[PDB]
Amino acid sequence: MRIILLGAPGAGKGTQAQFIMEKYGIPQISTGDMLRAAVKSGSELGKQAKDIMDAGKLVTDELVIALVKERIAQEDCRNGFLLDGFPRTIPQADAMKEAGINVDYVLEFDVPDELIVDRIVGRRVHAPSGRVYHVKFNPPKVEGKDDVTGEELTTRKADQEETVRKRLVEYHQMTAPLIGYYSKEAEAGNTKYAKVDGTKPVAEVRADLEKILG
Amino acid sequence: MRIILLGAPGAGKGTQAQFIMEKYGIPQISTGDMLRAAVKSGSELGKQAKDIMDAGKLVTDELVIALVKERIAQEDCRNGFLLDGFPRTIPQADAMKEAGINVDYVLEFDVPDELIVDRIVGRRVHAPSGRVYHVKFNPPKVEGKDDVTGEELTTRKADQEETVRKRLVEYHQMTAPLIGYYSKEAEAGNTKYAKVDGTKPVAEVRADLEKILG
Ligand SMILES: Nc1ncnc2c1ncn2[C@@H]1O[C@H](COP(=O)(O)OP(=O)(O)OP(=O)(O)OP(=O)(O)OP(=O)(O)OC[C@H]2O[C@@H](n3cnc4c(N)ncnc43)[C@H](O)[C@@H]2O)[C@@H](O)[C@H]1O
Protein backbone atom coordinates (compact mmCIF):
# COMPACT_ATOMS: atom_id res chain seq x y z
CA MET A 1 0.00 0.00 0.00
CA ARG A 2 1.37 3.46 -1.01
CA ILE A 3 -0.46 6.61 0.20
CA ILE A 4 0.16 10.39 -0.20
CA LEU A 5 -1.31 12.78 2.43
CA LEU A 6 -1.98 16.27 0.95
CA GLY A 7 -2.91 19.38 2.97
CA ALA A 8 -1.99 22.84 4.29
CA PRO A 9 0.86 23.03 6.86
CA GLY A 10 -1.03 22.55 10.20
CA ALA A 11 -4.12 20.71 8.75
CA GLY A 12 -3.55 17.61 11.01
CA LYS A 13 -2.24 15.11 8.39
CA GLY A 14 0.63 13.89 10.63
CA THR A 15 -1.74 13.07 13.52
CA GLN A 16 -3.61 10.55 11.26
CA ALA A 17 -0.38 8.97 9.88
CA GLN A 18 0.07 6.68 12.96
CA PHE A 19 -3.41 5.10 12.44
CA ILE A 20 -2.58 4.43 8.75
CA MET A 21 0.93 3.07 9.60
CA GLU A 22 -0.53 0.38 11.94
CA LYS A 23 -3.43 -0.50 9.55
CA TYR A 24 -1.14 -1.53 6.63
CA GLY A 25 2.09 -2.10 8.60
CA ILE A 26 3.87 0.56 6.48
CA PRO A 27 6.45 3.22 7.47
CA GLN A 28 5.70 7.00 7.54
CA ILE A 29 8.01 9.08 5.27
CA SER A 30 7.59 12.64 6.72
CA THR A 31 10.06 15.13 5.10
CA GLY A 32 9.47 17.53 8.04
CA ASP A 33 10.38 14.81 10.60
CA MET A 34 13.40 13.78 8.45
CA LEU A 35 14.72 17.39 8.11
CA ARG A 36 14.22 18.02 11.88
CA ALA A 37 16.07 14.70 12.51
CA ALA A 38 18.99 15.99 10.36
CA VAL A 39 19.15 19.18 12.52
CA LYS A 40 19.03 17.12 15.79
CA SER A 41 21.87 14.90 14.47
CA GLY A 42 24.10 17.74 13.21
CA SER A 43 24.27 16.25 9.68
CA GLU A 44 25.49 18.44 6.75
CA LEU A 45 21.85 18.50 5.48
CA GLY A 46 20.82 19.63 8.99
CA LYS A 47 23.35 22.48 8.77
CA GLN A 48 22.07 23.45 5.25
CA ALA A 49 18.32 23.20 6.08
CA LYS A 50 18.08 24.90 9.55
CA ASP A 51 18.05 28.55 8.28
CA ILE A 52 15.59 27.75 5.41
CA MET A 53 13.16 25.97 7.81
CA ASP A 54 13.37 28.82 10.40
CA ALA A 55 12.36 31.26 7.59
CA GLY A 56 9.22 29.14 6.90
CA LYS A 57 10.49 28.48 3.36
CA LEU A 58 10.61 25.17 1.42
CA VAL A 59 13.98 23.36 1.21
CA THR A 60 15.33 22.95 -2.38
CA ASP A 61 13.52 20.26 -4.46
CA GLU A 62 16.79 18.43 -5.38
CA LEU A 63 17.80 17.99 -1.69
CA VAL A 64 14.34 16.68 -0.60
CA ILE A 65 13.93 14.41 -3.69
CA ALA A 66 17.34 12.77 -2.99
CA LEU A 67 16.44 12.30 0.73
CA VAL A 68 13.05 10.67 -0.09
CA LYS A 69 14.50 8.52 -2.96
CA GLU A 70 17.12 7.12 -0.51
CA ARG A 71 14.48 6.52 2.24
CA ILE A 72 12.09 4.66 -0.19
CA ALA A 73 14.96 2.38 -1.40
CA GLN A 74 15.33 0.98 2.17
CA GLU A 75 14.11 -2.55 3.16
CA ASP A 76 11.17 -1.44 5.38
CA CYS A 77 9.52 0.37 2.36
CA ARG A 78 9.62 -2.65 -0.05
CA ASN A 79 6.01 -3.65 0.83
CA GLY A 80 4.62 -0.05 0.96
CA PHE A 81 4.92 3.41 2.59
CA LEU A 82 2.97 6.58 3.60
CA LEU A 83 4.29 9.90 2.15
CA ASP A 84 3.45 12.70 4.72
CA GLY A 85 4.50 16.22 3.58
CA PHE A 86 5.97 14.97 0.26
CA PRO A 87 5.57 15.88 -2.47
CA ARG A 88 5.15 19.65 -1.74
CA THR A 89 5.91 21.03 -5.26
CA ILE A 90 5.08 20.16 -8.90
CA PRO A 91 8.79 19.29 -9.54
CA GLN A 92 8.79 16.89 -6.51
CA ALA A 93 5.62 15.19 -7.90
CA ASP A 94 7.00 15.04 -11.50
CA ALA A 95 10.28 13.58 -10.12
CA MET A 96 8.35 10.67 -8.51
CA LYS A 97 6.10 10.10 -11.61
CA GLU A 98 9.06 10.21 -14.08
CA ALA A 99 10.90 7.72 -11.80
CA GLY A 100 7.89 5.36 -12.26
CA ILE A 101 6.41 5.58 -8.72
CA ASN A 102 2.56 5.51 -8.61
CA VAL A 103 0.54 5.50 -5.33
CA ASP A 104 -2.76 3.72 -4.48
CA TYR A 105 -4.44 6.63 -2.61
CA VAL A 106 -4.01 10.44 -2.43
CA LEU A 107 -5.91 11.77 0.64
CA GLU A 108 -6.53 15.57 0.89
CA PHE A 109 -7.10 17.19 4.35
CA ASP A 110 -9.06 20.47 3.93
CA VAL A 111 -8.72 23.12 6.71
CA PRO A 112 -8.97 26.95 6.21
CA ASP A 113 -5.90 29.17 6.93
CA GLU A 114 -7.33 31.13 9.91
CA LEU A 115 -8.36 27.88 11.73
CA ILE A 116 -4.72 26.62 11.27
CA VAL A 117 -3.21 29.87 12.70
CA ASP A 118 -5.54 29.57 15.75
CA ARG A 119 -4.88 25.78 16.05
CA ILE A 120 -1.02 25.91 15.99
CA VAL A 121 -0.99 28.19 19.11
CA GLY A 122 -1.83 24.98 21.07
CA ARG A 123 0.59 22.60 19.30
CA ARG A 124 3.01 20.95 21.79
CA VAL A 125 5.64 18.37 20.73
CA HIS A 126 7.91 15.70 22.21
CA ALA A 127 10.91 17.01 20.16
CA PRO A 128 13.00 13.76 20.43
CA SER A 129 10.24 11.39 19.03
CA GLY A 130 8.24 13.80 16.82
CA ARG A 131 5.02 12.92 18.73
CA VAL A 132 2.61 15.89 18.41
CA TYR A 133 -0.26 16.99 20.70
CA HIS A 134 -2.76 19.90 20.97
CA VAL A 135 -3.54 21.30 24.48
CA LYS A 136 -7.31 21.14 23.63
CA PHE A 137 -8.08 18.93 20.52
CA ASN A 138 -5.51 16.08 21.20
CA PRO A 139 -4.11 16.58 24.70
CA PRO A 140 -1.36 14.57 26.41
CA LYS A 141 -2.78 12.33 29.20
CA VAL A 142 -0.61 14.45 31.60
CA GLU A 143 -0.46 18.23 30.91
CA GLY A 144 3.00 19.24 29.59
CA LYS A 145 4.29 15.63 29.45
CA ASP A 146 4.84 13.02 26.69
CA ASP A 147 2.57 9.92 27.07
CA VAL A 148 5.41 7.43 26.28
CA THR A 149 8.58 8.88 28.00
CA GLY A 150 7.00 11.33 30.52
CA GLU A 151 9.46 14.01 29.23
CA GLU A 152 8.48 17.73 29.14
CA LEU A 153 6.77 18.80 25.88
CA THR A 154 8.05 21.83 23.95
CA THR A 155 6.68 24.56 21.67
CA ARG A 156 8.55 24.71 18.29
CA LYS A 157 10.17 28.17 17.77
CA ALA A 158 8.96 27.71 14.15
CA ASP A 159 5.29 27.79 15.39
CA GLN A 160 5.37 31.60 15.94
CA GLU A 161 2.23 32.99 14.11
CA GLU A 162 4.50 34.92 11.66
CA THR A 163 6.27 31.69 10.51
CA VAL A 164 2.89 29.80 10.41
CA ARG A 165 1.62 32.51 7.99
CA LYS A 166 4.85 32.30 5.84
CA ARG A 167 4.39 28.49 5.51
CA LEU A 168 0.72 28.99 4.46
CA VAL A 169 1.81 31.54 1.76
CA GLU A 170 4.36 29.02 0.36
CA TYR A 171 1.64 26.31 0.50
CA HIS A 172 -0.95 28.20 -1.59
CA GLN A 173 1.67 29.24 -4.20
CA MET A 174 3.66 25.96 -4.52
CA THR A 175 1.68 23.04 -2.93
CA ALA A 176 -2.08 23.72 -3.46
CA PRO A 177 -1.68 22.90 -7.22
CA LEU A 178 -1.01 19.21 -6.25
CA ILE A 179 -4.82 18.90 -5.67
CA GLY A 180 -5.31 19.27 -9.47
CA TYR A 181 -2.12 17.25 -10.16
CA TYR A 182 -3.38 14.10 -8.34
CA SER A 183 -7.08 14.64 -9.30
CA LYS A 184 -5.78 14.39 -12.93
CA GLU A 185 -3.68 11.29 -12.06
CA ALA A 186 -6.83 9.67 -10.53
CA GLU A 187 -8.83 10.44 -13.74
CA ALA A 188 -5.96 8.73 -15.70
CA GLY A 189 -6.46 5.61 -13.48
CA ASN A 190 -3.03 6.01 -11.76
CA THR A 191 -4.45 6.42 -8.18
CA LYS A 192 -7.63 6.91 -6.11
CA TYR A 193 -8.30 10.48 -4.79
CA ALA A 194 -10.47 11.41 -1.75
CA LYS A 195 -10.89 14.56 0.42
CA VAL A 196 -11.73 14.69 4.19
CA ASP A 197 -12.89 17.69 6.30
CA GLY A 198 -9.89 18.24 8.66
CA THR A 199 -11.97 20.68 10.81
CA LYS A 200 -13.76 17.70 12.46
CA PRO A 201 -12.40 16.11 15.66
CA VAL A 202 -9.39 13.73 15.39
CA ALA A 203 -11.69 10.68 15.95
CA GLU A 204 -14.14 11.79 13.20
CA VAL A 205 -11.33 12.39 10.62
CA ARG A 206 -9.90 8.94 11.56
CA ALA A 207 -13.31 7.27 10.95
CA ASP A 208 -13.74 9.13 7.60
CA LEU A 209 -10.28 7.84 6.55
CA GLU A 210 -11.27 4.31 7.73
CA LYS A 211 -14.38 4.41 5.47
CA ILE A 212 -12.28 5.60 2.43
CA LEU A 213 -9.58 2.91 2.91
CA GLY A 214 -11.88 0.17 4.36
CA MET B 1 19.88 22.21 37.20
CA ARG B 2 21.41 22.20 33.69
CA ILE B 3 24.49 24.35 32.96
CA ILE B 4 26.60 25.09 29.86
CA LEU B 5 30.22 26.35 30.33
CA LEU B 6 31.54 28.49 27.41
CA GLY B 7 35.10 29.81 27.18
CA ALA B 8 38.30 30.40 25.21
CA PRO B 9 40.88 27.63 25.12
CA GLY B 10 42.58 27.29 28.56
CA ALA B 11 40.14 29.69 30.33
CA GLY B 12 39.64 27.16 33.21
CA LYS B 13 36.15 25.65 32.52
CA GLY B 14 37.24 22.06 33.33
CA THR B 15 38.94 23.24 36.55
CA GLN B 16 35.65 24.92 37.76
CA ALA B 17 33.40 22.05 36.48
CA GLN B 18 34.73 19.76 39.24
CA PHE B 19 33.59 22.15 42.05
CA ILE B 20 30.09 22.61 40.47
CA MET B 21 29.72 18.76 40.24
CA GLU B 22 30.88 18.13 43.88
CA LYS B 23 28.72 21.03 45.21
CA TYR B 24 25.39 20.71 43.26
CA GLY B 25 25.29 16.88 42.85
CA ILE B 26 25.07 16.85 39.02
CA PRO B 27 27.35 14.94 36.62
CA GLN B 28 30.06 16.70 34.52
CA ILE B 29 29.54 15.93 30.78
CA SER B 30 32.99 16.62 29.19
CA THR B 31 33.08 15.86 25.41
CA GLY B 32 36.93 15.91 25.68
CA ASP B 33 36.89 13.34 28.53
CA MET B 34 34.39 11.11 26.61
CA LEU B 35 36.56 11.26 23.42
CA ARG B 36 39.78 10.52 25.40
CA ALA B 37 37.92 7.57 27.03
CA ALA B 38 37.26 6.18 23.49
CA VAL B 39 41.03 6.49 22.77
CA LYS B 40 41.89 4.62 26.03
CA SER B 41 39.47 1.76 25.07
CA GLY B 42 40.75 1.49 21.45
CA SER B 43 37.18 1.92 20.08
CA GLU B 44 36.59 2.85 16.38
CA LEU B 45 35.59 6.39 17.58
CA GLY B 46 38.87 6.64 19.55
CA LYS B 47 40.77 5.53 16.42
CA GLN B 48 39.15 8.35 14.33
CA ALA B 49 39.37 11.11 17.00
CA LYS B 50 42.99 10.77 18.33
CA ASP B 51 44.86 12.65 15.51
CA ILE B 52 42.13 15.37 15.18
CA MET B 53 42.31 16.11 18.94
CA ASP B 54 46.16 15.99 18.94
CA ALA B 55 46.18 18.65 16.13
CA GLY B 56 43.92 20.89 18.31
CA LYS B 57 41.05 20.59 15.76
CA LEU B 58 37.30 20.02 16.40
CA VAL B 59 35.80 16.49 15.99
CA THR B 60 32.74 16.28 13.65
CA ASP B 61 29.47 17.71 15.06
CA GLU B 62 27.53 14.46 14.29
CA LEU B 63 29.98 12.33 16.36
CA VAL B 64 30.02 14.59 19.49
CA ILE B 65 26.22 15.17 19.36
CA ALA B 66 25.73 11.35 19.37
CA LEU B 67 28.21 10.91 22.28
CA VAL B 68 26.29 13.56 24.30
CA LYS B 69 22.82 12.08 23.44
CA GLU B 70 23.95 8.61 24.71
CA ARG B 71 25.47 10.07 27.93
CA ILE B 72 22.55 12.37 28.99
CA ALA B 73 19.97 9.55 28.44
CA GLN B 74 21.54 7.81 31.51
CA GLU B 75 19.64 7.97 34.85
CA ASP B 76 22.43 9.97 36.65
CA CYS B 77 21.32 13.02 34.49
CA ARG B 78 17.61 12.97 35.62
CA ASN B 79 18.05 15.95 37.99
CA GLY B 80 20.49 17.94 35.82
CA PHE B 81 24.00 17.97 34.33
CA LEU B 82 26.94 20.31 33.48
CA LEU B 83 27.98 20.53 29.79
CA ASP B 84 31.77 21.20 29.81
CA GLY B 85 33.04 21.79 26.25
CA PHE B 86 29.62 21.19 24.64
CA PRO B 87 28.26 22.79 22.62
CA ARG B 88 31.35 24.18 20.72
CA THR B 89 29.66 25.04 17.34
CA ILE B 90 26.33 26.62 16.27
CA PRO B 91 25.20 23.26 14.67
CA GLN B 92 25.77 21.52 18.09
CA ALA B 93 23.71 24.30 19.81
CA ASP B 94 20.91 24.16 17.17
CA ALA B 95 20.88 20.33 17.59
CA MET B 96 20.14 20.84 21.33
CA LYS B 97 17.38 23.40 20.55
CA GLU B 98 15.67 21.15 17.93
CA ALA B 99 15.76 18.27 20.48
CA GLY B 100 14.13 20.45 23.19
CA ILE B 101 17.22 20.34 25.48
CA ASN B 102 16.75 23.51 27.57
CA VAL B 103 19.40 24.73 30.08
CA ASP B 104 19.04 26.94 33.20
CA TYR B 105 22.46 28.70 33.10
CA VAL B 106 25.11 29.56 30.47
CA LEU B 107 28.43 30.72 32.10
CA GLU B 108 31.09 32.36 29.83
CA PHE B 109 34.73 32.37 31.11
CA ASP B 110 36.33 35.68 29.86
CA VAL B 111 40.16 35.44 29.42
CA PRO B 112 42.23 37.54 26.94
CA ASP B 113 43.68 35.82 23.80
CA GLU B 114 47.19 36.87 25.04
CA LEU B 115 46.92 34.56 28.12
CA ILE B 116 45.84 31.43 26.11
CA VAL B 117 49.22 30.04 24.85
CA ASP B 118 50.62 30.33 28.43
CA ARG B 119 47.51 28.70 30.02
CA ILE B 120 47.77 25.64 27.65
CA VAL B 121 51.60 25.23 27.35
CA GLY B 122 51.93 24.94 31.17
CA ARG B 123 49.07 22.37 31.49
CA ARG B 124 49.97 18.98 33.06
CA VAL B 125 47.48 16.14 33.73
CA HIS B 126 46.99 12.92 35.78
CA ALA B 127 44.96 10.99 33.11
CA PRO B 128 43.56 8.20 35.34
CA SER B 129 41.83 10.70 37.74
CA GLY B 130 41.25 13.72 35.45
CA ARG B 131 43.29 15.92 37.85
CA VAL B 132 44.67 18.99 35.99
CA TYR B 133 47.59 21.22 37.08
CA HIS B 134 49.64 24.21 35.75
CA VAL B 135 53.50 24.21 36.18
CA LYS B 136 53.29 27.91 37.35
CA PHE B 137 49.65 29.05 38.03
CA ASN B 138 48.39 25.82 39.76
CA PRO B 139 51.38 23.54 40.41
CA PRO B 140 51.45 20.04 41.91
CA LYS B 141 52.78 19.83 45.54
CA VAL B 142 55.74 17.76 44.18
CA GLU B 143 57.07 18.84 40.74
CA GLY B 144 55.95 16.43 37.97
CA LYS B 145 53.95 14.17 40.34
CA ASP B 146 50.21 13.69 41.00
CA ASP B 147 49.25 14.92 44.54
CA VAL B 148 47.17 11.79 45.42
CA THR B 149 48.85 8.86 43.51
CA GLY B 150 52.43 10.20 43.12
CA GLU B 151 52.21 8.92 39.50
CA GLU B 152 54.12 10.99 36.88
CA LEU B 153 52.06 13.82 35.29
CA THR B 154 51.83 13.80 31.47
CA THR B 155 51.53 16.56 28.82
CA ARG B 156 48.75 16.21 26.21
CA LYS B 157 50.12 16.19 22.62
CA ALA B 158 47.86 19.19 21.72
CA ASP B 159 49.23 21.26 24.67
CA GLN B 160 52.10 22.79 22.55
CA GLU B 161 52.42 26.45 21.35
CA GLU B 162 51.92 25.42 17.68
CA THR B 163 48.51 23.71 18.15
CA VAL B 164 47.11 26.17 20.86
CA ARG B 165 47.49 29.14 18.46
CA LYS B 166 45.57 27.20 15.71
CA ARG B 167 42.96 26.32 18.38
CA LEU B 168 42.34 30.03 19.25
CA VAL B 169 41.71 30.75 15.51
CA GLU B 170 39.20 27.84 15.07
CA TYR B 171 37.78 29.13 18.39
CA HIS B 172 37.18 32.65 16.98
CA GLN B 173 35.46 31.28 13.82
CA MET B 174 33.41 28.32 15.20
CA THR B 175 33.01 28.53 19.03
CA ALA B 176 33.11 32.29 19.94
CA PRO B 177 29.75 32.81 18.08
CA LEU B 178 28.01 30.79 20.90
CA ILE B 179 28.48 33.87 23.19
CA GLY B 180 26.01 35.88 21.03
CA TYR B 181 23.88 32.72 20.52
CA TYR B 182 23.19 32.16 24.28
CA SER B 183 23.16 35.93 25.06
CA LYS B 184 20.22 36.09 22.56
CA GLU B 185 18.57 32.98 24.14
CA ALA B 186 18.86 34.63 27.61
CA GLU B 187 17.42 37.92 26.26
CA ALA B 188 14.40 35.81 25.11
CA GLY B 189 13.96 34.34 28.65
CA ASN B 190 15.09 30.79 27.64
CA THR B 191 18.15 30.73 30.02
CA LYS B 192 20.18 32.83 32.51
CA TYR B 193 23.52 34.14 31.10
CA ALA B 194 26.50 35.26 33.23
CA LYS B 195 30.06 36.35 32.27
CA VAL B 196 32.85 35.29 34.72
CA ASP B 197 36.33 36.93 34.90
CA GLY B 198 38.51 33.80 34.31
CA THR B 199 41.82 35.68 34.97
CA LYS B 200 41.13 35.76 38.76
CA PRO B 201 42.68 33.08 41.02
CA VAL B 202 41.00 29.60 40.90
CA ALA B 203 39.46 30.23 44.41
CA GLU B 204 38.03 33.65 43.37
CA VAL B 205 36.43 32.26 40.14
CA ARG B 206 34.92 29.41 42.23
CA ALA B 207 33.44 32.05 44.60
CA ASP B 208 32.00 34.09 41.68
CA LEU B 209 30.30 30.92 40.31
CA GLU B 210 28.81 29.91 43.74
CA LYS B 211 27.16 33.37 43.97
CA ILE B 212 25.61 32.92 40.48
CA LEU B 213 24.40 29.29 40.97
CA GLY B 214 23.16 29.97 44.56
N1 LIG C 1 8.65 18.14 0.85
C1 LIG C 1 9.29 19.21 1.32
N2 LIG C 1 9.92 20.02 0.45
C2 LIG C 1 10.57 21.09 0.92
N3 LIG C 1 10.72 21.49 2.17
C3 LIG C 1 10.10 20.66 3.02
C4 LIG C 1 9.39 19.53 2.69
N4 LIG C 1 8.89 18.93 3.83
C5 LIG C 1 9.30 19.69 4.81
N5 LIG C 1 10.04 20.76 4.39
C6 LIG C 1 10.67 21.78 5.22
O1 LIG C 1 10.46 21.47 6.58
C7 LIG C 1 9.72 22.55 7.21
C8 LIG C 1 8.85 21.98 8.29
O2 LIG C 1 7.89 21.11 7.66
P1 LIG C 1 6.36 21.26 8.05
O3 LIG C 1 5.57 21.70 6.87
O4 LIG C 1 6.23 22.06 9.30
O5 LIG C 1 6.06 19.73 8.34
P2 LIG C 1 5.40 19.08 9.63
O6 LIG C 1 5.56 19.99 10.79
O7 LIG C 1 5.84 17.67 9.71
O8 LIG C 1 3.87 19.11 9.17
P3 LIG C 1 2.62 20.01 9.58
O9 LIG C 1 3.06 21.16 10.40
O10 LIG C 1 1.82 20.22 8.36
O11 LIG C 1 1.85 18.97 10.51
P4 LIG C 1 0.34 18.49 10.36
O12 LIG C 1 -0.50 19.69 10.56
O13 LIG C 1 0.21 17.70 9.12
O14 LIG C 1 0.16 17.55 11.63
P5 LIG C 1 0.23 17.86 13.20
O15 LIG C 1 0.22 16.55 13.91
O16 LIG C 1 1.38 18.76 13.46
O17 LIG C 1 -1.15 18.63 13.47
C9 LIG C 1 -1.16 20.07 13.67
C10 LIG C 1 -1.76 20.43 15.01
O18 LIG C 1 -3.20 20.25 14.95
C11 LIG C 1 -3.63 19.31 15.90
N6 LIG C 1 -4.69 18.51 15.29
C12 LIG C 1 -4.52 17.40 14.51
N7 LIG C 1 -5.64 16.90 14.06
C13 LIG C 1 -6.62 17.75 14.56
C14 LIG C 1 -8.02 17.77 14.43
N8 LIG C 1 -8.70 16.87 13.72
N9 LIG C 1 -8.69 18.76 15.05
C15 LIG C 1 -8.00 19.66 15.75
N10 LIG C 1 -6.68 19.75 15.94
C16 LIG C 1 -6.04 18.75 15.31
C17 LIG C 1 -2.39 18.52 16.31
O19 LIG C 1 -2.51 17.99 17.61
C18 LIG C 1 -1.31 19.60 16.22
O20 LIG C 1 -1.26 20.41 17.38
C19 LIG C 1 8.99 23.21 6.04
O21 LIG C 1 8.53 24.51 6.36
C20 LIG C 1 10.12 23.19 5.01
O22 LIG C 1 11.11 24.14 5.33
Ligand SMILES: Nc1ncnc2c1ncn2[C@@H]1O[C@H](COP(=O)(O)OP(=O)(O)OP(=O)(O)OP(=O)(O)OP(=O)(O)OC[C@H]2O[C@@H](n3cnc4c(N)ncnc43)[C@H](O)[C@@H]2O)[C@@H](O)[C@H]1O
Ligand atom coordinates in the same frame (compact mmCIF):
# COMPACT_ATOMS: atom_id res chain seq x y z
N1 LIG D 1 32.08 19.78 21.60
C1 LIG D 1 33.15 19.39 20.91
N2 LIG D 1 33.11 19.43 19.56
C2 LIG D 1 34.20 19.03 18.88
N3 LIG D 1 35.36 18.59 19.34
C3 LIG D 1 35.37 18.56 20.68
C4 LIG D 1 34.34 18.93 21.51
N4 LIG D 1 34.71 18.77 22.84
C5 LIG D 1 35.93 18.31 22.79
N5 LIG D 1 36.39 18.16 21.50
C6 LIG D 1 37.71 17.68 21.10
O1 LIG D 1 38.38 17.21 22.25
C7 LIG D 1 39.56 18.03 22.49
C8 LIG D 1 39.84 18.10 23.98
O2 LIG D 1 38.91 18.97 24.66
P1 LIG D 1 39.23 19.29 26.19
O3 LIG D 1 39.56 18.04 26.92
O4 LIG D 1 38.18 20.17 26.77
O5 LIG D 1 40.59 20.13 26.08
P2 LIG D 1 40.84 21.64 25.63
O6 LIG D 1 39.76 22.05 24.69
O7 LIG D 1 42.26 21.82 25.24
O8 LIG D 1 40.59 22.37 27.01
P3 LIG D 1 39.85 23.76 27.24
O9 LIG D 1 40.30 24.69 26.18
O10 LIG D 1 38.40 23.50 27.43
O11 LIG D 1 40.46 24.20 28.64
P4 LIG D 1 39.69 24.59 29.98
O12 LIG D 1 38.94 25.84 29.71
O13 LIG D 1 38.98 23.39 30.45
O14 LIG D 1 40.92 24.87 30.95
P5 LIG D 1 41.56 23.97 32.10
O15 LIG D 1 40.54 23.79 33.15
O16 LIG D 1 42.18 22.76 31.51
O17 LIG D 1 42.70 24.96 32.62
C9 LIG D 1 43.74 25.35 31.70
C10 LIG D 1 45.04 25.48 32.44
O18 LIG D 1 45.02 26.68 33.25
C11 LIG D 1 45.06 26.38 34.62
N6 LIG D 1 44.05 27.20 35.27
C12 LIG D 1 42.71 26.94 35.38
N7 LIG D 1 42.05 27.88 36.00
C13 LIG D 1 43.00 28.83 36.31
C14 LIG D 1 42.93 30.07 36.98
N8 LIG D 1 41.80 30.60 37.45
N9 LIG D 1 44.07 30.77 37.12
C15 LIG D 1 45.21 30.25 36.64
N10 LIG D 1 45.40 29.10 36.00
C16 LIG D 1 44.24 28.43 35.87
C17 LIG D 1 44.82 24.87 34.75
O19 LIG D 1 45.53 24.35 35.85
C18 LIG D 1 45.36 24.34 33.42
O20 LIG D 1 46.76 24.10 33.43
C19 LIG D 1 39.24 19.33 21.76
O21 LIG D 1 40.41 20.09 21.48
C20 LIG D 1 38.58 18.77 20.50
O22 LIG D 1 39.49 18.19 19.59
